[PDB]
Every structure is written in structure tokens, then in C-alpha cells.
């Protein structure tokens, strides 16, 4: 720690502003929307849909969210200064992982339900996707994350570090990215120390492989859209 205490406190605030500005929905609104849950008739409605139809809807939502994650990255203090090769490399590797974190963030542990298209619904809502092993692992990851009770600032700093990771293969300016990552670790480390929550990152499960799969499904649909019904 050569950086002065006041400078790091600002970096925390700047990163949080970027996360809040770029969420699809404010967390506070999400908690207030927990009362309305899809009705059993609405749920069956979703289950009636064809595998392709439910994947086509879910994949569009993953891509919409990715777009908001790219905006998050733009707001990071040093992201724009990086060469476009590096900007793209970091987003390919990490942007889906952030997405899963942001969508799993809109979850309610009391009744095991997720905010989805305007109302909260349970795991049963997704039966049409037909990948129950993937859907149950994703709901687990969400339940574990809820137990840890990340604040908006803790979730903003952690997602920031996911994107700004200097070990991705294909980075031209490796040293420049390490400098940007280190500054975020300094910031985040300080914030955990002040709140006595240093241990929380260890307890978070790895979502990398889950996101790898989600990206594979998103890609699957774009490669094969000519074989399915037109938009």
C-alpha cells in the first residue's frame, strides 16, 4: 500500500456507481418485487413451451445482459485505455461469469425463487430448457451466494475483479492489466478489512464452469438458428 487512503476510498465509490448505473434493475426494486410470484397457471405456461422456444427466450436474455456488462467494463477507470484486443479478450473470458452473478443476485432464498421476466419464479419455471443438471447447479450457486449476503459495493468490486483479470490468454499489454487489477485488489482488500469480512471470497463457489456452459448454449443457438423457426 503506497496509494493514499482517500484515493482508494474514491475508487470503491467509482466502481459502485458503475455497477449500480449499469444493473438492468436496481437491487432495492428487486427486493420490493419479491411479493409478486408467477401464478401456478403462469408457470405451466412456461413449461408448455418447446425446448427451442424457452432456450431462444433465455439466450436473448443472456445476450441483453452481456451488453449491460460491457457498459460496466467501460466505466472502469482504466478499461478504455487498454487496446481493443485486450478489451475484447477480457470480456470474452469474464463477461458471462459476471452475467450469472448479476442474474443469480436477483434471487430469494426464503422460497428458492429467481427474478425472471417481471416476476419471481422457482426452478420448475425452467423445465422446458431440459438441462435439469445445469439448472439445479445454477440454483445451488445462487443459494450459496445468498447465504454470504454480498452488499452492492462488495458485489460491484468482486464482479470488477472478474472482468479485470490479467491471466487471460491472448493479452498484449499484460503488465498494464496487472496494474489495473492490483489497484482493484488494494481497494477491495481495504473494504473487506474495514467490515471484518476477509473470509467471504473463499466461501463463494466457482461459477466459471457454469458460465462456460451458459456461453456454450448461447453459441449453440446462434450456430443452429437456420434449422429453427425465424425471428
Amino acid at each position: 500500500p503506497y496509494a493514499s487512503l482517500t484515493e482508494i476510498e474514491h475508487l470503491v465509490q467509482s466502481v459502485c456507481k458503475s455497477y449500480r448505473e449499469t444493473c438492468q434493475l436496481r437491487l432495492e426494486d428487486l427486493l420490493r418485487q419479491r411479493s409478486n410470484i408467477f401464478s401456478r397457471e403462469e408457470v405451466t405456461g412456461y413449461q408448455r413451451k418447446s425446448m427451442w422456444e424457452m432456450w431462444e427466450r433465455c439466450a436473448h436474455h443472456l445476450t441483453e445482459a452481456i451488453q449491460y456488462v460491457v457498459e460496466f467494463a467501460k466505466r472502469l477507470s482504466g478499461f478504455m485505455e487498454l487496446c481493443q484486443n485486450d478489451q475484447i479478450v477480457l470480456l470474452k473470458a469474464g463477461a458471462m461469469e459476471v452475467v450469472l452473478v448479476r442474474m443469480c443476485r436477483a434471487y430469494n432464498a426464503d422460497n428458492r425463487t429467481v427474478f425472471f421476466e417481471g416476476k419471481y419464479g422457482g426452478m420448475e419455471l425452467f423445465r422446458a430448457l431440459g438441462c435439469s443438471e445445469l439448472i439445479s447447479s445454477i440454483f445451488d450457486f445462487s443459494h450459496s451466494l445468498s447465504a454470504l449476503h454480498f452488499s452492492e459495493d462488495e458485489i460491484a468490486l468482486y464482479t470488477a475483479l472478474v472482468l479485470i483479470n490479467a491471466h487471460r490468454p491472448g493479452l498484449q499489454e499484460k503488465r498494464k492489466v496487472e496494474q489495473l487489477q492490483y489497484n482493484l485488489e488494494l481497494a477491495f482488500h481495504h473494504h473487506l478489512c474495514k467490515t471484518h469480512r476477509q473470509s467471504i471470497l473463499a466461501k463463494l463457489p466457482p461459477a466459471g464452469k457454469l458460465a462456460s456452459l451458459c456461453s456454450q448454449h448461447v453459441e449453440r443457438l446462434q450456430i443452429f438458428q437456420h434449422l429453427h423457426p425465424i425471428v
Partner: peptide, 15 residues
């Protein structure tokens, strides 16, 4: 959604 993966991020980054 025709654009996906790296193609959507490239389009998204131009701004």
C-alpha cells in the same frame, strides 16, 4: 438474436 459471443461484445464496445 443473430449477433452473439465475441461479435455482440465487439458491436457493444464500439460506442
Amino acid at each position: 438474436t443473430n449477433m452473439g459471443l465475441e461479435a455482440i461484445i465487439r458491436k457493444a464496445l464500439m460506442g
